[PDB]
């Protein structure tokens, strides 16, 4: 996260770290959506241009974390993966269209003050909140700058951007399965996700029921926090029918 700040304790209790077993290192962010299911970006698990194709036994999920590098004894919980599910129409060849994946845990995680699931949006909450200018919150342990790494989880609030502005900021083809967020050059304020924040959640607090909803997944950007560029997020609601199909048939 570029130009963010340290999270408060318990501020993002759905935050998940994807962790490689060997070498032991951070791979990506992710989010907790129930006691057995974690949501992430598909490119965290499968990206052939970078020779990335992880299997379940390659990975661990670390939940309840605040420090990036510490083993947070008595606070974090570490879970093994039973199965990975990648969207069948995930487009790693072109533009990361449908950049979404689910991971089922081997055993349910116990909730605590530090571990708690985020809500997924219904159609009405998505329609009401996914509007240009409305702000969401992005969190992660990724790079602090494009060109180092944070001691603790970082958080930044960013406004959703009008779709024509998103499209006009890039040569990459944008789809309805994406939205973009970030400040414009004339707005002054700054902030973006960066490498290592992949797969982490873009959340909004509904003013109707005071619950946090995950509207996006950190997907891609051209540089980090560059003027005139924006961060692109997987549109969770647009892909919710697939999420529901996976959980109903494999839960």
């Amino acid at each position: 996260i570029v130009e963010g700040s340290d999270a408060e304790i318990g501020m993002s209790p759905w935050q998940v770290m994807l962790f490689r077993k060997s070498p032991q290192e951070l791979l990506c962010g992710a989010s907790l959506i129930s006691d057995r299911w974690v949501l992430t970006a598909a490119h965290c698990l499968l990206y052939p241009p970078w020779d990335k194709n992880f299997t379940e036994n390659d990975l661990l999920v670390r939940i309840g974390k605040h420090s990036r590098t510490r083993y947070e004894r008595n606070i974090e919980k570490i879970s093994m993966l039973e199965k990975i599910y990648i969207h069948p129409r995930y487009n790693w060849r072109e533009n990361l269209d449908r950049d979404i994946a689910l991971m089922k845990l081997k055993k349910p995680v116990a909730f605590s003050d530090y571990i708690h699931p985020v809500c997924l949006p219904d159609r009405e909450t998505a329609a009401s909140l996914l509007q240009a200018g409305y702000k969401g919150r992005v969190t992660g342990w990724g790079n602090l700058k494009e060109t180092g790494q944070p001691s603790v989880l970082q958080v930044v609030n960013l406004p959703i951007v009008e779709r024509p502005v998103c499209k006009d900021s890039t040569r990459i083809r944008i789809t309805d399965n994406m939205f973009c967020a970030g400040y414009k050059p004339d707005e002054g304020k700054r902030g973006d996700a960066c490498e290592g924040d992949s797969g982490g959640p873009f959340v909004m607090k509904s003013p109707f029921n005071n619950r946090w909803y995950q509207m996006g997944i950190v997907s891609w950007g051209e540089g980090c926090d560059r003027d005139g560029k924006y961060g692109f997020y997987t549109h969770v609601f647009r892909l919710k029918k697939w999420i529901q199909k996976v959980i109903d048939q494999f839960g």
Binding site: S22, T69, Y71, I78
Partner: peptide, 11 residues
């Protein structure tokens, strides 16, 4: 860079 995690999770 990362503190070692308990061996039980790597078995």
């Amino acid at each position: 860079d990362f503190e070692e995690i308990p061996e039980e999770y790597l078995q």
